Amino acid sequence: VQIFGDQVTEERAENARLSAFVGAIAVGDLVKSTLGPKGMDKLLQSASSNTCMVTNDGATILKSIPLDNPAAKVLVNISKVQDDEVGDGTTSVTVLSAELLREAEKLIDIHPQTIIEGYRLASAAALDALTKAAVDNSHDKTMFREDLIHIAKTTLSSKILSQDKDHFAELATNAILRLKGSTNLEHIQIIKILGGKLSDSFLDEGFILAKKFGNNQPKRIENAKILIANTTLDTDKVKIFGTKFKVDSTAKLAQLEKAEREKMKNKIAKISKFGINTFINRQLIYDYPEQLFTDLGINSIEHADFEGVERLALVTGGEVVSTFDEPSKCKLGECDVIEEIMLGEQPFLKFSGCKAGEACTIVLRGATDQTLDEAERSLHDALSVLSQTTKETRTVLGGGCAEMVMSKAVDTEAQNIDGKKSLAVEAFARALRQLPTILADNAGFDSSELVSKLRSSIYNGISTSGLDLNNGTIADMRQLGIVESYKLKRAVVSSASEAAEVLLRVDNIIRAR
Amino acid sequence: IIVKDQGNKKRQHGLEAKKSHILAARSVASIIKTSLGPRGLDKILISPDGEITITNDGATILSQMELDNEIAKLLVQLSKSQDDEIGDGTTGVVVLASALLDQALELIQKGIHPIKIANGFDEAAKLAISKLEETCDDISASNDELFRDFLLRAAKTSLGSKIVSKDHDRFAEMAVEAVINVMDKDRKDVDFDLIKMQGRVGGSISDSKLINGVILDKDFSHPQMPKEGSDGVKLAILTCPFEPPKP
Amino acid sequence: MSLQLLNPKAESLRRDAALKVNVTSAEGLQSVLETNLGPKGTLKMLVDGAGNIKLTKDGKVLLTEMQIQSPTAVLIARAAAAQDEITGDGTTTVVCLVGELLRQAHRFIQEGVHPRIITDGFEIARKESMKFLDEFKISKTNLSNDREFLLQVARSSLLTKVDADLTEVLTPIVTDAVLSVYDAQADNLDLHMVEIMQMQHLSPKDTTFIKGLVLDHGGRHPDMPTRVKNAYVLILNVSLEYEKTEVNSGFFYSSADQRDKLAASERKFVDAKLKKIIDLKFVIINQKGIDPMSLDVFAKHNILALRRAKRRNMERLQLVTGGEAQNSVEDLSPQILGFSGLVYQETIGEEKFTYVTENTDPKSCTILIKGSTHYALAQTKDAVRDGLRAVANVLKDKNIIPGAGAFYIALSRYLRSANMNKLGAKGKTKTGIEAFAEALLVIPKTLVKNSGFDPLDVLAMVEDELDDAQDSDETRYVGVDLNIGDSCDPTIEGIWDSYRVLRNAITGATGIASNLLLCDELLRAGRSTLKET
Amino acid sequence: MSLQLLNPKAESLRRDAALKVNVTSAEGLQSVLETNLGPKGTLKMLVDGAGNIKLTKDGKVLLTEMQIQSPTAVLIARAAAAQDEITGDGTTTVVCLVGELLRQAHRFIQEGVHPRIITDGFEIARKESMKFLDEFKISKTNLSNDREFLLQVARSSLLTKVDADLTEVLTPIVTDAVLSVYDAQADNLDLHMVEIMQMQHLSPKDTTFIKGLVLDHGGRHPDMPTRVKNAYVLILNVSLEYEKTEVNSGFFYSSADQRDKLAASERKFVDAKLKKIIDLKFVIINQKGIDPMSLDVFAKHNILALRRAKRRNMERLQLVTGGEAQNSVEDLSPQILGFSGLVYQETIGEEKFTYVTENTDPKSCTILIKGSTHYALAQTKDAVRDGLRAVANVLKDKNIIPGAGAFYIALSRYLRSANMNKLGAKGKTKTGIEAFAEALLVIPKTLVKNSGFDPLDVLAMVEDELDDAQDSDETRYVGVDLNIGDSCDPTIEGIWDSYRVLRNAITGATGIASNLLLCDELLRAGRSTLKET
Amino acid sequence: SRSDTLFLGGEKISGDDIRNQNVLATMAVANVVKSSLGPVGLDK
Numbered sequence A: 001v002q003i004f005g006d007q008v009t010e011e012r013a014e015n016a017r018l019s020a021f022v023g024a025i026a027v028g029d030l031v032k033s034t035l036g037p038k039g040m041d042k043l044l045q046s047a048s049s050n051t052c053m054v055t056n057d058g059a060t061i062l063k064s065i066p067l068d069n070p071a072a073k074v075l076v077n078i079s080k081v082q083d084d085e086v087g088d089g090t091t092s093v094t095v096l097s098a099e100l101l102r103e104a105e106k107l108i109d110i111h112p113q114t115i116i117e118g119y120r121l122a123s124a125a126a127l128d129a130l131t132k133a134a135v136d137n138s139h140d141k142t143m144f145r146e147d148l149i150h151i152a153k154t155t156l157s158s159k160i161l162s163q164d165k166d167h168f169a170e171l172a173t174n175a176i177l178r179l180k181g182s183t184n185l186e187h188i189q190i191i192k193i194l195g196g197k198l199s200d201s202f203l204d205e206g207f208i209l210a211k212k213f214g215n216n217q218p219k220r221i222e223n224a225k226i227l228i229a230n231t232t233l234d235t236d237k238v239k240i241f242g243t244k245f246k247v248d249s250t251a252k253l254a255q256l257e258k259a260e261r262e263k264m265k266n267k268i269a270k271i272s273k274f275g276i277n278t279f280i281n282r283q284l285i286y287d288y289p290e291q292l293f294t295d296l297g298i299n300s301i302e303h304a305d306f307e308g309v310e311r312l313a314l315v316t317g318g319e320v321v322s323t324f325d326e327p328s329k330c331k332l333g334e335c336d337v338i339e340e341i342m343l344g345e346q347p348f349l350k351f352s353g354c355k356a357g358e359a360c361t362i363v364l365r366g367a368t369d370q371t372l373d374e375a376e377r378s379l380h381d382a383l384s385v386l387s388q389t390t391k392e393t394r395t396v397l398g399g400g401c402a403e404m405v406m407s408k409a410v411d412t413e414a415q416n417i418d419g420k421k422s423l424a425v426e427a428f429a430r431a432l433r434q435l436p437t438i439l440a441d442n443a444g445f446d447s448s449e450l451v452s453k454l455r456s457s458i459y460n461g462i463s464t465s466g467l468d469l470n471n472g473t474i475a476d477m478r479q480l481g482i483v484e485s486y487k488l489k490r491a492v493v494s495s496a497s498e499a500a501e502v503l504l505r506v507d508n509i510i511r512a513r
Numbered sequence B: 001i002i003v004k005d006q007g008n009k010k011r012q013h014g015l016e017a018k019k020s021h022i023l024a025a026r027s028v029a030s031i032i033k034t035s036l037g038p039r040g041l042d043k044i045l046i047s048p049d050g051e052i053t054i055t056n057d058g059a060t061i062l063s064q065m066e067l068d069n070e071i072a073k074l075l076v077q078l079s080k081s082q083d084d085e086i087g088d089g090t091t092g093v094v095v096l097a098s099a100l101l102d103q104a105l106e107l108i109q110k111g112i113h114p115i116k117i118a119n120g121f122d123e124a125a126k127l128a129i130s131k132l133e134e135t136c137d138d139i140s141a142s143n144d145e146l147f148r149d150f151l152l153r154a155a156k157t158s159l160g161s162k163i164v165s166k167d168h169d170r171f172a173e174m175a176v177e178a179v180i181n182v183m184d185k186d187r188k189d190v191d192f193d194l195i196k197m198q199g200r201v202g203g204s205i206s207d208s209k210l211i212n213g214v215i216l217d218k219d220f221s222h223p224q225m226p227k228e229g230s231d232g233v234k235l236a237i238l239t240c241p242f243e244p245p246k247p
Numbered sequence C, D: 001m002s003l004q005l006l007n008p009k010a011e012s013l014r015r016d017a018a019l020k021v022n023v024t025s026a027e028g029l030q031s032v033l034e035t036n037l038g039p040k041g042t043l044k045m046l047v048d049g050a051g052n053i054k055l056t057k058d059g060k061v062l063l064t065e066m067q068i069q070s071p072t073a074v075l076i077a078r079a080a081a082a083q084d085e086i087t088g089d090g091t092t093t094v095v096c097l098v099g100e101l102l103r104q105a106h107r108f109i110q111e112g113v114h115p116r117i118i119t120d121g122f123e124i125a126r127k128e129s130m131k132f133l134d135e136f137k138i139s140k141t142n143l144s145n146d147r148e149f150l151l152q153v154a155r156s157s158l159l160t161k162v163d164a165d166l167t168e169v170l171t172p173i174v175t176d177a178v179l180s181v182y183d184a185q186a187d188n189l190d191l192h193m194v195e196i197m198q199m200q201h202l203s204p205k206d207t208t209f210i211k212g213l214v215l216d217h218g219g220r221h222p223d224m225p226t227r228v229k230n231a232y233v234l235i236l237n238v239s240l241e242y243e244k245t246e247v248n249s250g251f252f253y254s255s256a257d258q259r260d261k262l263a264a265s266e267r268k269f270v271d272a273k274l275k276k277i278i279d280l281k282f283v284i285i286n287q288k289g290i291d292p293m294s295l296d297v298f299a300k301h302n303i304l305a306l307r308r309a310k311r312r313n314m315e316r317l318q319l320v321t322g323g324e325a326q327n328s329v330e331d332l333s334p335q336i337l338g339f340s341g342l343v344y345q346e347t348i349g350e351e352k353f354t355y356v357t358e359n360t361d362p363k364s365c366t367i368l369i370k371g372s373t374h375y376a377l378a379q380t381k382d383a384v385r386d387g388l389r390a391v392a393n394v395l396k397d398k399n400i401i402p403g404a405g406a407f408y409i410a411l412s413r414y415l416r417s418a419n420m421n422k423l424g425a426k427g428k429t430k431t432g433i434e435a436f437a438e439a440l441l442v443i444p445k446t447l448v449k450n451s452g453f454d455p456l457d458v459l460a461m462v463e464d465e466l467d468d469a470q471d472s473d474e475t476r477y478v479g480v481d482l483n484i485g486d487s488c489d490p491t492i493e494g495i496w497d498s499y500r501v502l503r504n505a506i507t508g509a510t511g512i513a514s515n516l517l518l519c520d521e522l523l524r525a526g527r528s529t530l531k532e533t
Numbered sequence E: 001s002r003s004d005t006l007f008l009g010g011e012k013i014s015g016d017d018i019r020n021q022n023v024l025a026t027m028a029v030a031n032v033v034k035s036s037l038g039p040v041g042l043d044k
């Protein structure tokens, strides 16, 4: 009886396997049509916001799906995982899994908990060989830029924005360059506005704050020496707080003048700081911009926290604390500041030559207000790949090379073990072998005859190769410039045969409502 | 030759609506896989009526277990076929229809056309039904008469691996004898069973025995009325009514 | 039972079905916006769940103000807005082509041409088409500075709907109107410099725009200047009602009735500031209102006082009569002046209205729009708004370009040419290219055929055919004449369109179809019970 | 409130909406029957509300056995049957063209071509197309009488589905089968002369047809001829069970047990009639059964007795072993004889079955159809049925004609020719004519493109294009080869189709679209609550 | 899960659960009358 109280369901053994193995592939078939430019994007509508997302990103494609199954929701984690650690390929990190465990399923006809031993030891041999075939270097900034572009390209392909692939691959490799290795990708913010067309998405060496100058002031600035003030341009008062009572009637006769004056010290403190423009975290009283406009000092009321620093780390002028305590020694060396004239509201600008770098990769795409999103997340998938190469100089060739080398290597070992654990090995390879196969489905080439074709070439060449999606020749990926970073294609491999383990050990389950 | 331009698929429903039955069918031939061979087990069947059935005949077991998927249904008839044709392997043939369909799965999954697999399989069919002779020409046996050492052993294996496993000795021979006599000295022929087996719910397996003559389900006239058995007897297949002459 | 998930209340319209639900709705938003193009077109009355009525022909209007549940649809509806923002017109053009182009897509699948291969196609055609659009040129950046025809061109733009039939008076009124705030839009200063007041009277014809901002104000006191003659003004934005120092001050009279001195103090503290204004130089204007007392001081010191000048107006007030919106008068008057023009006040349509007869530096202006029904004006504002935004931006990008289909088939002709080299390079992708043209052609047919019903000129067959036969030659020439039902050169006919506009009508479209064909599946998670109802 | 009626629960899909609901469903029945044409095609499993399973590729089967609520659909579904009745094959062809042709209709409305003007168009094209079909000829009315190729042609007809792959054995089995009942179908004697017995065994391959009717009977008594050697027979249909004079007779014995004489009387009255049969000449066959007594008389008088010979069989029994179905033997035997062939009885598939090894005048015959599943045979019977009806009628109209698309494009080529004179006479109606062709072309594309997926030969583009370029010349030549993916002449390839068939595939179609375009509106009056469910 | 056939009202237990349900179902009818036998036994 008890237990803890039904209704609670319980699935064990045979079916619990299928329902999990078959349960995952369920996700995999839909997920796969997103490999190589001959790749698809899926729509995703959210109940609440009643707005839809269109893009192709394995992480998002699944993070946006309400799915009941534990084995599926599990995969949805793998994706949302690699996306974090690596950044690209998330679309496939499951593909090799669903296939992998579908392999394990057939193999299960034969203990499971041992199959995990193979997939962790045999796909370790694969993991190893893939390091061997890797190509390091160079480390000359002369050569780097030419590789990073090739990476950004191979990644930026197959995404709505592929049309001007270069245009973006450049956007990425730049923002990555600034801030050596390895720095957080949190200072370079991807802002987006709905502006006519595509490719009008440039990279910005400054910041693009939302706010527009207060009053009827100039829209441009020469030799910008901005000022990073904090406190609002309003008469101050202790945070603990205090009350001032006008005990004396004559005390107000002087109190009134104390008003206009206790803020006129703002103007004097501004001109004296040599600063030319200003902007404050907290808001400024209408009694201030008035003085600012006549002087010609520019008013920029209220700025976000992270924006207060962007404007700062752009010119390195230190975040001033309270007006009149600010040294002319601290100022913003901004090259220019303007008000771009977008439809409706227009954002202000903080251009910088270095700069500085606090890149803002603003992207427009009026064509579709929901393509910017669809795009500015692909620019990211680029960025995070152009960085992994900096942190990890290692790189490897795609187009099916990755899997080819493994399944090739792994293949031999399986025929050597002549052990039951050994068959395990062979599947670990046939799972990989599946990835390129699937990569053919989308391009259009017959799979079966395309891997065998591809596996011979690895032998003639080894391991450089791959299967061409579009350009003729079935040419090597190093020639066609189809490569992505090596550690990424590691995490992918391991991280998959990982969930393949945990998920292959469950055997039985218990679910309540 | 083949290149990039060609050429999409007009509809995809075809694909999945094929990977569908491949499953629904598989499952049947999967949960039935436990009753093959001497170490197989039977199953209880509660009728939609109420009757209870416990049996090893997978061709009866499949029919008893209500099925939905129209294709899974198909699987049933192909099991009931082997019974009307041969009379054995009602279960094995199903576990075959699985493996095949289950690997035709693997095939389609690798850009192998269904129809190409259909006859592609059927080719291996006619080669299999032919290889069966090249393995019994030959090395083993093909005896049909004058030898009970085998005919019995055919049932001994056949008798074996059922509820009657323990009591088969009597069963095995009995069957063989009850069959071989309906065509003995008549040569080989397609034969239909005129043999009649009637069962009384009283006793254990072994109690059952061959009758050197005839048996009838109907009881005597009992004291309806006055019975058996007339000493030496002389029967009559009386026909028509026996009541007071009525037109 | 299975589950099979996925999840309940969720559905996967996948593959071809996805291909259906995708395409099958995009052109849904066709039959809705088909009417709008063509001077012979007609408008639509939209109702809502709040029991209201809208009868206007604008597309952003009939797409934003609609209820739709098929992604693609909402998506193109989204593309409709993109336009209305960045440019006045072309939202309608963006959809019709968007859809029709996508219609031609679900068609190549009758031939079995991979979508990615059609993105590839449309991609070439898309840019190759815009190319020839660039090639037309014809910009009046240089003198003849007058570029009156270009102004005529916006009017050509606004033709159809309701406003176009009357005139021909709007372009002159808009043209001039923009020309004042022309230099203004270039600066990043929005169109809000032009205000539109609905004082319905007479007929949408009698409507007119007076030089010198009009305002609905006073003059809130009888002993006040009904009219100000030549007098100067002052645009200000200081506090007159709170009358409290910007400090945490709490006057506490420890004595017996010391408040009698404080309650007079602040009651005079305003008189001090009040006296600087008395100090110059006359009328006063200020955003924040002026309480009964302070405002009644000006009245006696011969200073017409105007309170509650909306933020828009104070900025607008700065634009006309060149003034500075400066509050602090403790420094007055460094860089603080307020020019002006006689400010006679005149009621219109039973409504009080003060407007300045005389003024200077008019970089802004109000335009009254009389009419026959409140429903009518709501639709004139949009028409003026559309055409007023077109002209606006055209003054930012001088690039002109002929209207009436010329621009379209010019794109279509130039397209099919490279295209009919398109198959050769490389074959199937070509049809996609070739197909692209069919779109820009089709929009023109929709323009006359399904929309230009009368005068009786509407044949989908003949008209289009006339342009291709007679249009390859006229490179940017031979447009259409949906009035007489002939192919006549627009250029001699004033059919001038904005380059920016007719460019984006494609940029958008092209960019739309692309990401849509990329669709393999589409999923949703229910939010409301059912709701099949 | 209004009402406005009309009536509740009724709806008027009018005009263009009617144009939609009309067209918009006709091609609905397309995606359903698209699979059936082409040897590379595939079948469909149909379920119902009674929990049953059908997996067959026939169209009348997938259209009659369907649930549909859009008139046009049901209407074409109706046209599907018309075929299945009057001819074996072409039901599928009738719909695909019917729909596709109607698809091309809702298309001319993109050009604005009045429907009546398209009826006018299609009308010319329709007859002008059938014309060239007539022109092909090629009939084998005269010797070489063998006309084996024509028989080969029916097999070509039945190619695809399930049966076609095996052979090539069916045509020989059907051909011969029809050839026996050939003279029989000409007489108006239906196909029921051929019976099909399902005794599933082995594989659909092992299935075969034995000369000499088979029957499932006896032989209902042990003391009876297991087999009859050379013995003659008698086909009869008299009463053996009721044994009552055809009169209102009520034997009333006013005496004490006079019934003892009457109950013996009638019990002997049968012996009298029984004795005439004993009188000739041996076995007896009779529709109406023979009660335990009478039948047990024959058994002892050396006369194998066969009871319960279904009406079909008695007629069939007359056909084989030439006998007369005569009851009255009070005149026997004027014009009353019953020839025969040895009648050995043999069980098949565990089922008792008496068949006659030897016989004469075989104008009918039974054909067993073993198989693998009851589902399989159900679909073989239809395939044999389809192809068996084709051959049947072809023997009634010798007119042959090449298959594989040749016949189709031959119609299409000949069409577009007059058609491309069609605009000239007179212009717009021409496009309708021209369009008609597009249909017959399209069916061929559907045949390979959307249906002939593999072997990998399927391109909608290339194939069709090959025929037009290479088909105008081959007048009735150049068909298709959906096996290798090439254009090869059918005639050398045995691709022979029935003239009657490929004629009607159009006659029907043409007649269908016509009355459909005539549709302005369509109304309905609900019958079931809701039922939106 | 499943799909298998067929629900509802039609179900099946597998291996262990059955071999148990069977034993429990037997001890049930058994353990009731397990007191009866023997002179020391009673009636009900």
Ligand SMILES: Nc1ncnc2c1ncn2[C@@H]1O[C@@H](COP(=O)(O)OP(=O)(O)O)[C@@H](O)[C@H]1O
Pocket: B035, B036, B037, B038, B040, B056, B057, B088, B089, B090, B091, B092, B093, B157, B161
């Ligand atoms: N001596 C044996 N040892 C192991 N398996 C055997 C033996 N004899 C027969 N079998 C297996 O059992 C048979 C198949 O029986 P089947 O009709 O399919 O269902 P069931 O096993 O319940 O009778 C064989 O053909 C074989 O594979």
Ligand SMILES: Nc1ncnc2c1ncn2[C@@H]1O[C@@H](COP(=O)(O)OP(=O)(O)O)[C@H](O)[C@H]1O
Pocket: A034, A035, A036, A037, A039, A056, A057, A058, A088, A089, A090, A091, A092, A154, A155, A157, A158, A159, A381, A398, A399, A400, A439, A466, A467, A468, A469, A482, A484
């Ligand atoms: N140009 C190419 N040619 C062949 N294979 C490619 C090419 N570009 C990418 N691939 C392979 O297919 C890709 C699939 O895209 P992926 O990064 O996994 O997710 P997404 O495309 O959604 O960002 C692989 O990363 C890669 O190895």
Ligand SMILES: Nc1ncnc2c1ncn2[C@@H]1O[C@H](COP(=O)(O)OP(=O)(O)O)[C@@H](O)[C@H]1O
Pocket: D036, D037, D038, D039, D058, D059, D089, D090, D091, D092, D093, D156, D157, D158, D159, D160, D386, D403, D404, D405, D447, D480, D481, D482, D483, D495, D497
């Ligand atoms: N052996 C063949 N090879 C290629 N096409 C064929 C062949 N036989 C027939 N066809 C043609 O392909 C189509 C489909 O077969 P069909 O006779 O129409 O079957 P059904 O009409 O009952 O669906 C027709 O146009 C037909 O004549």
Ligand SMILES: Nc1ncnc2c1ncn2[C@@H]1O[C@H](COP(=O)(O)OP(=O)(O)O)[C@H](O)[C@@H]1O
Pocket: C036, C037, C038, C039, C059, C089, C090, C091, C092, C093, C156, C157, C158, C159, C160, C386, C403, C404, C405, C447, C480, C481, C482, C483, C495, C497
């Ligand atoms: N008198 C005319 N004759 C022929 N074409 C005209 C004439 N006047 C205007 N046109 C053109 O017809 C087209 C359709 O109008 P359109 O731009 O679609 O209005 P909107 O975009 O606001 O819906 C051109 O863009 C242009 O205005």
Ligand code: BEF
Pocket: A056, A057, A058, A087, A088, A089, A090, A091, A155, A378, A381, A382
């Ligand atoms: F992996 Be991709 F960037 F979605």
Ligand code: BEF
Pocket: B056, B057, B058, B088, B089, B090, B091, B158, B161, B162
């Ligand atoms: F199926 Be076994 F022969 F019992």
Ligand code: BEF
Pocket: C036, C057, C058, C059, C088, C089, C090, C091, C092, C093, C386
């Ligand atoms: F439709 Be238009 F832009 F008003």
Ligand code: BEF
Pocket: D036, D037, D057, D058, D059, D089, D090, D091, D092, D161, D386
């Ligand atoms: F539809 Be047919 F009979 F193949």
